Design a protein around this ligand. Structure first.
Ligand code: N72
Ligand code: GLC
Ligand code: CL
Length: 493
């Protein structure tokens, strides 16, 4: 039986395999193969209702939902001889995850007061205030992944390149800018993987990646957001196409503090000459959808009536003239070379010329671009992402003033949005589902009318597999919008 899987992704390299820092789809995908968490999404699901036992066998909460106790499975062992997974490892991981100096996702854990190892198999988490979902924070995504205290202490700066998890796969070696070689974790607590090896290959160029998949060089390849790729790959009977939840929302985040965009009329002019409905139609409706708000449509608290500015390029030119620009505006955007983001920026560039904007694009490799946008190097940021499907996540990270670039608490608030802080904070601890949803909708209307960010389309993850490969479960979703490979993944006879 075939046991070695070859996979091709839209990425140039590994940046970090430390789960408290892994942000790009590619790093998050590799991290989902290496690590586990206290709780997890069911394999093949990106649905929170599927949150179930992983390292924690079970858990208990008190009535005020501030104290959560987790009972750890005793049979879970670390990769690379680091022995049994203990409560001390969980305390270390969660204390690191909630630390802004040692984590990119500390903001998610702001409500945590303390994490205690009651005994070797028992973890107690105490919250200062209520969170919409504590289990969400402790799931196998972002800062929820558990790392060994002793392995991080020993490896330090090398840990991001030599990761240690308790997941079904381990990193044997990294071939910088070429591939990651993963081998089966033979001691994986749910059983020995059916696959012996994963060759995870960096194949950014779409035409080259498609050739490699077509020839059989790859068993799995990442697709794009275009219906032609979808049609061509379905036409060959040896392939199966997977359209994966969650959909990642793409927005033009405008830095509201920088001229000419510190004038609301200029931001409104830009919002009126982008055509999200045309983007969805051009790309294809199965994978792509125009979003009538500034957060993905699958979110608890989503506002379908957020008041998104309509397509009116005549109004754009009228607004620009009122703002002192009768001959238009030139904007230079630092643009990611991730092919989907590059194609999207190219379609935006053609569209915004209708309303008087000359959009110049400075192409930069994706991971380097991620660092530049976090140093305020672009006046506008074309960013595509999904978060845990509760409005608090997307709203805090992208639009709360504490998340703005330049602060030690910075997340992904590229727009320097500061209009919905009170509504975001109030919704976070609001008990009843309806008035919590109303505060979230209030936040969305304020973010939209201030034109902090212009929503475009949201896209489901697109991947192709050869018929011979079975995921070992039905693939509907995966939090990174990329396939999950587990101990159940196998090749058919
Ligand atoms: O989690 C995050 O913060 C980053 C999200 C991660 N997603 C990839 C991405 O932006 C999307 O695929 C994107 O919607 C484009 O391909 C749009 O066509 C990235 O930048 O690699
Ligand atoms: O734009 C085309 C080029 O970009 C791609 O992302 C690859 O890095 C390179 O192999 C290719 O020739
Ligand atoms: Cl990348």
């Amino acid at each position: 039986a075939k046991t070695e899987l070859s996979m091709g992704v839209a990425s140039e390299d590994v940046t970090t395999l430390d789960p408290h820092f892994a942000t790009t789809t590619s790093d998050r995908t590799l991290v989902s193969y290496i690590y586990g968490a206290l709780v997890r999404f069911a394999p093949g699901s990106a649905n929170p209702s599927s949150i179930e036992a992983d390292l924690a066998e079970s858990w208990e909460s008190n009535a005020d939902q501030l104290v959560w106790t987790f009972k750890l499975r005793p049979d879970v062992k670390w990769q690379g001889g680091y022995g049994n997974v203990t409560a001390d490892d969980v305390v270390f991981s969660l204390d690191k995850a909630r630390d802004p100096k040692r984590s990119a996702f500390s903001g998610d854990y702001a409500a945590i007061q303390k994490v205690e190892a009651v005994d070797a198999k028992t973890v107690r988490i105490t919250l200062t205030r209520r969170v919409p979902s504590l289990l969400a924070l402790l799931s196998n995504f972002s800062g929820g992944f558990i790392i060994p205290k002793k392995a991080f202490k020993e490896r330090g700066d090398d840990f991001k390149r030599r990761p240690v998890g308790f997941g079904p796969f381990q990193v044997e070696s990294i071939q910088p800018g070429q591939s990651v070689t993963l081998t089966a974790n033979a001691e994986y607590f749910r059983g020995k993987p059916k696959l012996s090896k994963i060759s995870y290959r960096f194949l950014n160029n779409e035409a080259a990646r498609d050739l490699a998949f077509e020839s059989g060089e790859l068993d799995v390849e990442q697709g794009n957001q275009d219906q032609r790729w979808l049609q061509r790959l379905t036409a060959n009977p040896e392939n199966v196409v997977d359209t994966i939840e969650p959909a990642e929302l793409n927005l033009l985040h405008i830095n509201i503090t920088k001229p000419p965009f510190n004038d609301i009329r200029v931001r409104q002019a830009l919002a009126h000459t982008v055509n999200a409905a045309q983007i969805a139609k051009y790309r294809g409706e199965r994978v792509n959808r125009a979003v009538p708000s500034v957060i993905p449509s699958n979110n608890l608290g989503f506002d379908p009536d957020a008041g998104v500015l309509n397509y009116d390029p005549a109004q754009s030119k009228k607004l620009l003239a009122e703002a002192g620009f009768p001959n238009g505006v030139t904007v230079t955007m630092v643009a990611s070379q991730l092919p989907g983001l590059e194609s999207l920026a190219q379609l935006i560039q053609a569209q915004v010329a209708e309303g008087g904007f000359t959009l110049n694009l400075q192409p930069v490799e994706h991971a380097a671009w991620h660092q530049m946008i976090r140093k305020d190097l672009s006046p506008i940021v074309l960013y595509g992402a999904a978060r845990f499907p509760i409005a608090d996540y997307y709203l805090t990270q992208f639009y709360h003033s504490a998340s703005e670039i330049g602060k030690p608490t910075q997340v992904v608030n590229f727009s320097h949005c500061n209009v919905a802080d009170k509504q975001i904070e109030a919704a976070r601890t609001e008990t009843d589902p309806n008035k919590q949803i109303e505060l979230w909708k209030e936040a969305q209307k304020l973010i939209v009318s201030n034109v902090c960010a212009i929503p475009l389309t949201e896209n489901l993850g697109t991947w192709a597999r050869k018929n011979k490969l079975g995921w070992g479960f039905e693939l509907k979703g995966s939090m990174p919008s990329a396939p999950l490979i587990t101990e159940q993944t196998y090749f058919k006879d």
